[PDB]
Amino acid sequence: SLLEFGKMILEETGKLAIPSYSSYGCYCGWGGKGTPKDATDRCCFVHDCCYGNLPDCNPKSDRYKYKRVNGAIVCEKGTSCENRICECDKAAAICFRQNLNTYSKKYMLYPDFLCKGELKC
Amino acid sequence: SLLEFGKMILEETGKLAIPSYSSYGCYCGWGGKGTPKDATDRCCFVHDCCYGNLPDCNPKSDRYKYKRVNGAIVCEKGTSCENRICECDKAAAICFRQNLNTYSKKYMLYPDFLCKGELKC
Numbered sequence: 445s446l447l448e449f450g451k452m453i454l455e456e457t458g459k460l461a462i463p464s465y466s467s468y469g470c471y472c473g474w475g476g477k478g479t480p481k482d483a484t485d486r487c488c489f490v491h492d493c494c495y496g497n498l499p500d501c502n503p504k505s506d507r508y509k510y511k512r513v514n515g516a517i518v519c520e521k522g523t524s525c526e527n528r529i530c531e532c533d534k535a536a537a538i539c540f541r542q543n544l545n546t547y548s549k550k551y552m553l554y555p556d557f558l559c560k561g562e563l564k565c
Numbered sequence: 566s567l568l569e570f571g572k573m574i575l576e577e578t579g580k581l582a583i584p585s586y587s588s589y590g591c592y593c594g595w596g597g598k599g600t601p602k603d604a605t606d607r608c609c610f611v612h613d614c615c616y617g618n619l620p621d622c623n624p625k626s627d628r629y630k631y632k633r634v635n636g637a638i639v640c641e642k643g644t645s646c647e648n649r650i651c652e653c654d655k656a657a658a659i660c661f662r663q664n665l666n667t668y669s670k671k672y673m674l675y676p677d678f679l680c681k682g683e684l685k686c
């Protein structure tokens with residue numbers, strides 16, 4: 445659920461999910477059209493493709509449990525869903541960190557309008 | 566406070582907070598349930614998620630000051646609360662303007678039974 449995801453993001457990046465990621469570029473915060481603006485934006489994209497491959501699950505709402513082992517995110521075992529969701533979230537979060545040095549305020553609150561067309565995931 | 570938030574809304578969109586954004590979709594208003602129905606509805610969803618990260622404050626009434634600098638909304642300095650509350654509002658109003666394009670009357674006075682999922686933040 446967004447609760448775990450949003451928390452994941454602050455642990456990895458140091459930024460609050462809200463302002464910093466709720467409306468970044470074309471895919472951050474949700475949306476789904478356009479050509480990803482940058483690296484951070486490419487991760488929201490990939491994260492969206494990840495959620496899209498869990499038809500049997502409720503990604504944005506099911507609570508899953510995860511722990512940090514020696515500074516690394518580890519998805520605890522739960523249902524098939526809670527596990528796959530958690531991995532999607534971990535991948536996005538970690539990515540976010542990896543590209544912090546390219547994070548551009550220039551893309552926060554980006555006009556969803558400017559994004560046109562649907563990329564084949 | 567809502568008096569400042571309503572001012573930004575009228576400035577950025579030209580519409581009055583009450584009709585235009587008080588009974589729109591599943592989140593612009595007070596009910597708050599289901600899955601956002603469109604761009605404008607999500608701005609509202611993100612906004613009260615933003616008010617959620619401010620437990621130690623009270624957004625409805627503490628008044629803050631803001632001004633424009635080269636036409637942009639800037640939150641004047643003050644107490645941590647006043648500043649964070651304003652950032653939530655600032656973003657929301659800008660979000661309503663960037664989406665004036667898809668704002669449709671079909672979502673006004675939207676029925677409760679049409680607000681679906683379980684969503685938390």
Ligand SMILES: CCCCCCCCCCCCC(=O)O
Nearest residue numbers: 461465466472473474488491492
């Ligand atoms: C428009 C949405 C606000 C709630 C989103 C809080 C965290 C947003 C960042 C995750 C990216 C979303 C996914 O990959 O689409």
Ligand SMILES: CCCCCCCCCCCCC(=O)O
Nearest residue numbers: 567571582586593594609612613
């Ligand atoms: C005249 C008095 C205040 C008008 C301000 C109404 C605020 C409307 C904004 C939509 C709700 C935002 C979200 O749920 O936070």
